[PDB]
């Protein structure tokens, strides 16, 4: 039973408490749920089980495992790029969690009232004029927490309170990387989510929120980007194409039942993704009648949909400040844990390419150097134009690229290494072969679904928007450059490999570089080709 809560804990985090509800809104409530379940079942879970098995079998880290097909190690490097974009922006989300946490340490929560100076005459108030109405939380966020500018170019001046919390949010993970209870860390996220869930349903208008969340949009299924963002979310929330799944499972015992692990983790992942959306949309159902705005257009937003909605149900709870302290503290410990695993993975991968204790003794200074760099690169995110950049990374740089990187791995393993060889490798450590649902998903369903979604997204491209603000030509170009910066690691490393490798021919040098390295396989007893 104690071994169950460990899997439950990995299935909850900021990826689905903050980021799932916001993506489910942008693409339309019910319009994203059907594409999400389809992409998670057919493409998400089989790729998740493959990244565990690939790592667990070879018993080697994120970069080193690509000696299975030595030319494709550019995939392994690409996964570090995805990790480096995540790690620097995922921390400004933790900064805002710290801000609302520290800001909660009062006798009365500030975002509950329209009496404060930053509030406009538009403001509606829950506890307390205009054609358009705004919530006190929606204005506290938009004007006090982050003085949002009119454009990306208008950086104005850094938000000094957020820039300060960014130092705390980097120190608190760094000081844990030097040093490094399942009953509390696995139940606390769910007991606090249940408190807000009860509140969310007992509000008037909650049904109109829930209805929008669940009832599907068959007219909106034909839009390529709805699948692009659903494929991104299924792959992001599990950990696919970050590299950490290969690194953590590489430590894992050879004969561990990674099938029982991949099903259990991904199931309670979906059960938590739906519950976190459920509470948000039930709150947006109350805000709809309250603001006199249709549910679809209460907040056609980006990142803010946790920081605009959870503070709202929190005001509606009795002894409200007590609960807001626990809720933001919960988000903080959730993010710090995933950052610890994100940075530990990355340092271990970067260090092991360089001489053992020529750079392995600098594991400390390099971890410190990584933290210092992430701070200096996170400064434009604490700017007056913060969330404009936070979204640009989260919907270009660190979104669909996870789907192609984990699919090139699937092509490289299934058609070049050999599906036949790979299904026998799984059997050596599980006893049973991969199920028929996975065998076909890996060879046909996932690479074709991911391919078609890629093709129609290139055709049906339209420039990106946050709260109906369209992004300029220079900013979307940087979006492309980041989104393909991490994917071009695949072709670029192959140009270097084909130059180094032997053959001096068109096809034979490729057949040399693509076939396994001679050092491959696990340790001691675990062989059936030796």
């Amino acid at each position, epitope marked *: 039973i104690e071994f169950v809560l460990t899997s439950v804990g990995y299935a909850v985090g900021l990826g689905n408490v903050w980021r799932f509800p916001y993506l489910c809104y942008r693409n339309g409530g019910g319009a994203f749920m059907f594409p999400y379940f389809i992409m998670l079942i057919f493409c998400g879970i089989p790729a998740f089980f493959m990244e565990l098995s690939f790592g667990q079998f070879a018993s080697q880290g994120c970069l080193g495992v690509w000696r299975i097909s030595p030319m494709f190690k550019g995939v392994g490097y690409g996964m570090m790029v995805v990790s480096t974009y995540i790690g620097i922006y995922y921390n400004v989300v933790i900064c805002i969690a710290f801000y609302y946490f520290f800001s909660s340490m009062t006798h009365v929560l500030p975002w509950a009232y329209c009496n404060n100076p930053w509030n406009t005459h538009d403001c509606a108030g829950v*506890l307390d004029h205009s054609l358009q109405r705004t919530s006190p939380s929606e204005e506290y966020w938009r004007l006090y927490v982050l003085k949002l500018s009119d454009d990306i170019g208008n950086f104005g001046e850094v938000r000094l309170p957020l820039l300060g919390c960014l130092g705390v949010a980097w120190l608190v993970v760094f000081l844990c990387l030097i040093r490094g209870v399942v009953y509390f860390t696995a139940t606390f996220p769910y007991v606090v989510l249940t408190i807000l869930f009860v509140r969310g349903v*007992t509000l008037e208008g909650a049904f109109d929120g829930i209805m929008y969340y669940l009832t599907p949009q068959w007219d909106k299924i034909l839009e390529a980007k709805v699948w692009g963002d659903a494929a991104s979310q299924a792959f992001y929330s599990l950990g696919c194409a970050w590299g950490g799944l290969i690194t953590m499972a590489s430590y894992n015992k050879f004969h561990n039942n990674c099938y029982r692990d991949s099903v259990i983790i991904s199931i309670t992942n979906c059960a938590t993704s739906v519950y976190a959306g459920f509470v948000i949309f039930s709150i947006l159902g109350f805000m709809a009648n309250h603001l006199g705005v249709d549910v679809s257009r209460v907040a056609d937003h980006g990142p803010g949909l946790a920081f605009v909605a959870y503070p709202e149900a929190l005001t509606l709870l009795p002894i409200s400040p007590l609960w807001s302290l626990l809720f933001f503290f919960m988000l903080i410990l959730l993010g710090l844990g995933t950052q610890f695993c994100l940075l530990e993975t990355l340092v271990t991968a970067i260090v092991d390419e360089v001489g053992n204790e020529w750079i392995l003794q600098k594991k400390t200074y390099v971890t410190l150097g990584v933290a210092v760099a992430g701070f200096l690169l996170g400064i434009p995110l604490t700017s007056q134009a913060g969330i404009y950049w936070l979204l640009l990374m989260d919907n270009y740089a660190a979104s669909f690229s996870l789907v192609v990187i984990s699919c090139i791995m699937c092509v490289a393993i299934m058609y070049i290494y050999g599906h036949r060889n790979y299904f026998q490798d799984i059997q050596m450590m599980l006893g049973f072969p991969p199920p028929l649902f996975f065998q076909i998903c890996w060879r046909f369903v996932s690479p074709a679904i991911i391919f078609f979604i890629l093709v129609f997204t290139v055709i049906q491209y339209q420039p990106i928007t946050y709260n109906h603000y369209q992004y300029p030509g220079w900013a979307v170009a940087i979006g492309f450059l980041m989104a393909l910066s991490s994917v071009l690691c695949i072709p670029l490393y192959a140009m270097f490999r084909l130059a180094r490798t032997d053959g001096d021919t068109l096809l034979q040098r490729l057949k040399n570089a693509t076939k396994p390295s001679r050092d491959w396989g696990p340790a001691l007893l675990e062989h059936r080709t030796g």
Partner: nanobody, 120 residues
Framework: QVQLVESGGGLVQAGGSLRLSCAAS????????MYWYRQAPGKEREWVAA????????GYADSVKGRFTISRDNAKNTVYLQMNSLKPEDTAVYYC??????????????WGQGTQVTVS
């Protein structure tokens, strides 16, 4: 600001039924949870019922559960207590109530005028 206004009580026989009504103004009541209490003459104030902002859940006192039916209509900004199968022990001053936390650690009890129900 907060004003609460009961109506509908009176004198009735044992076995009768009365529906008390309460209207609410000065605040967005559709986002509040409404409560009803009764205090018999000389005795302390007992709890009677409570209803959700939406109206999904309602709870009651054990000497009331299985008899009274609380309800509300957030369009009119009203709460009601349909008190079926009344008995001589229900003779008390019935007060409409709402507990405003104010997004704070303490709550203010706003009260109605108190409408009598006398059962013989």
């Amino acid at each position: 600001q907060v004003q609460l206004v009961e109506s509908g009580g009176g004198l009735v026989q044992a076995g009768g039924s009365l529906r008390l009504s309460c209207a609410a103004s000065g605040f967005p009541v559709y986002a509040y949870e409404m409560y009803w209490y009764r205090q018999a003459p000389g005795k302390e104030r007992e709890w009677v019922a409570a209803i959700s902002s939406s109206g999904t859940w309602a709870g009651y006192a054990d000497s009331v559960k299985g008899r009274f039916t609380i309800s509300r209509d957030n369009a009119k900004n009203t709460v009601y207590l349909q008190m079926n199968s009344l008995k001589p022990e229900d003779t008390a001053v019935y007060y409409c109530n709402v507990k405003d936390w104010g997004a704070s650690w303490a709550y203010y009890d706003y009260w109605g005028q108190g409408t009598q129900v006398t059962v013989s």
